[PDB]
Each structure stands twice: as structure tokens, then as C-alpha cells.
Paper text:
We initially determined the crystal structure of P. aeruginosa Orn (OrnPa) with diribonucleotide substrate; however, crystal packing contacts prevented substrate binding (data not shown). Instead, we were able to crystallize two representative homologs, OrnVc and the human REXO2 (also known as small fragment nuclease or Sfn [Bruni et al., 2013]), bound to the diribonucleotide pGpG. Superimposing the two structures indicates their identical fold (rmsd of 0.75 Å for the protomer), which is preserved in the substrate-free Orn structure determined previously (rmsd of 0.54 Å for the protomer). The pGpG-bound structures reveal a narrow active site that is lined by the conserved acidic residues of the signature DEDD motif (D12, E14, and D112 of OrnVc; D15, E17, and D115 of REXO2) and the general base H158 or H162 in OrnVc or REXO2, respectively. Residue numbering for REXO2 refers to its cytosolic isoform lacking the mitochondria-targeting pre-sequence. The corresponding residues, W64 and Y132, are conserved in REXO2. Most notably, residues S108, R130, S135 and the hydroxyl group on Y129 (S111, R133, S138, and Y132 in REXO2) form hydrogen bonds with the 5' phosphate of pGpG, capping the substrate. This phosphate cap creates a major constriction of the active site, which is not observed in structurally related 3'−5' exoribonucleases such as RNase T or ExoI. RNase T and ExoI accommodate longer RNA substrates, facilitated by an expansive active site.
Among them, Oligoribonuclease (Orn) is unique as its activity is required for clearing short RNA fragments, which is important for cellular fitness. Here, we show that Orn exhibits exquisite substrate preference for diribonucleotides. While other cellular RNases process oligoribonucleotides down to diribonucleotide entities, Orn is the one and only diribonucleotidase that completes the terminal step of RNA degradation. From this we propose a general model of RNA degradation, wherein a combination of exoribonucleases process oligoribonucleotides down to diribonucleotides and Orn completes RNA recycling by cleaving diribonucleotides to nucleoside monophosphates.
Author numbering: 4 to 186
């Protein structure tokens, strides 16, 4: 029971931008780890259809980055609606975590939570309200462990959801192994 309740729901999203009032989710991936960051199950890794007009009006940063990664083209070709994507992720976490008990995890994953609370509220209902923000640990590492901070793994920062989740886990594992108290 406690082991199940101590799992983590790792999620990373791509969005058309950071404006919660207009922007939409275009990519989502999800991994489950145990409390010790071992990957237990790989969830859906989905590209969500959104309208051409929204993609055409994205910021220059988003056009450049989602364009070169292939994501923009894949969004235009997608047949996955937001609602169907949500169901895939909700079904996955229902198979993997007890209801209400496990947190979202990722780098600045509160931004993903802001989008998910609005656009996948039933998925979020399965999760705790707390988060495991790897960037909180990053910012504490930078302050309290500046020497160790220089050794954190370099990120490819490809802005593709599943690859970025994996790098987030690796960053948190680095902090656990290097700035937390030794047993
Ligand atoms: Na992210």
C-alpha cells in the first residue's frame, strides 16, 4: 500500500505556448516510477491534434522549435483529440497508481499541472495536488551545493515529451546521489 502510494507520475508536455487562456497541449508523455525513481511502466506518448490556425499563430520560438523537431507536422497529421488522449492517460494511471495519492513529477511540472488542471481535469483528479518539481531541487542545488551543481548532467533539451521526462529523472537521480545525506 505505502509503496504504491509513494509512486510518482512523471509527465512532460509540449504546448503551443505558455498562455493558459489560448494555448493548447500538443504532446504528452507519462512514465511511472517507484519512490526510488526506477521506471515501472511507460505510459502513452501522444501527439494531440490542434487547429492549423493555432499552430500558424504560435510564437517564433514555438514555430522554430516545434517545427524543427517534427512536432508541428505531426500535430497537423494527428487523429488524436485532447479528450481521447486524456482517456489514454487516465486509464494508464488508474492501472498504475492508487487514486488521489501520487504526485506529478518533472522539471517545473507546475506548468504542466496548470495546463492539465484546465485541459485534462479527470486525469488530474486521479493524482495528488502536490508535485515533485525537479527544478525546486535544481534551484536548491545551485544555492547550497554550487560545486556539485557544476557536475549535473547536460540536457539535450529537445522539447519532445518522452525524451525530456527521461532527462528530468536523470537530473533528480543526480541530486539524490550527490547532494542528499548518505546512508
Ligand atoms: Na516541460
Amino acid at each position: 500500500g505505502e509503496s504504491m502510494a509513494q509512486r510518482m507520475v512523471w509527465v512532460d508536455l509540449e504546448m503551443t505556448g505558455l498562455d493558459i487562456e489560448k494555448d493548447q497541449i500538443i504532446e504528452m508523455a507519462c512514465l511511472i516510477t517507484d519512490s526510488d525513481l526506477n521506471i515501472l511502466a511507460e505510459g502513452p506518448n501522444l501527439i494531440i491534434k490542434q487547429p492549423d490556425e493555432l499552430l500558424d499563430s504560435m510564437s517564433d520560438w514555438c514555430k522554430e522549435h516545434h517545427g524543427k523537431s517534427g512536432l508541428t507536422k505531426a500535430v497537423k497529421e494527428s487523429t488524436i483529440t485532447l479528450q481521447q488522449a486524456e482517456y489514454e492517460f487516465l486509464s494508464f494511471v488508474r492501472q498504475q497508481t492508487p487514486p488521489g495519492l501520487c504526485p506529478l513529477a518533472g522539471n517545473s511540472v507546475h506548468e504542466d499541472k496548470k495546463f492539465l488542471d484546465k485541459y485534462m481535469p479527470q486525469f488530474m483528479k486521479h493524482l495528488h495536488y502536490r508535485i515533485i518539481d525537479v527544478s525546486t531541487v535544481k534551484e536548491l542545488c545551485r544555492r547550497w551545493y554550487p560545486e556539485e551543481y557544476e557536475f549535473a548532467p547536460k540536457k539535450a533539451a529537445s522539447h519532445r515529451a518522452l525524451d525530456d521526462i527521461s532527462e528530468s529523472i536523470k537530473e533528480l537521480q543526480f541530486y539524490r546521489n550527490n547532494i542528499f545525506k548518505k546512508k
